[PDB]
């Protein structure tokens, strides 16, 4: 179903128990220690970062 923060990039991805994607987010201005796993619905138009991670360019 959280406060908005700017995303720098996507570090990793995985499937949850329900078969949907979750993404490990690198938050702009923060280090790897603060990365969090977030479901798709928490990302607001992050298609560019998802494409970069998947290699689409």
């Amino acid at each position: 179903g959280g406060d908005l923060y700017e995303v720098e990039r996507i570090v990793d991805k995985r499937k949850n128990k329900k078969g949907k994607w979750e993404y490990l987010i690198r938050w702009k201005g923060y280090g790897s220690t603060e990365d969090t796993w977030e479901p798709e619905h928490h990302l607001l138009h992050c298609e560019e970062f998802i494409d970069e991670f998947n290699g689409l360019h």
Binding site: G2, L4, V7, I25, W27, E38, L44, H45
Partner: peptide, 9 residues
Amino acid sequence: ATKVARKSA
């Protein structure tokens, strides 16, 4: 909005 996301606890 683009390139932002909601962050969990």
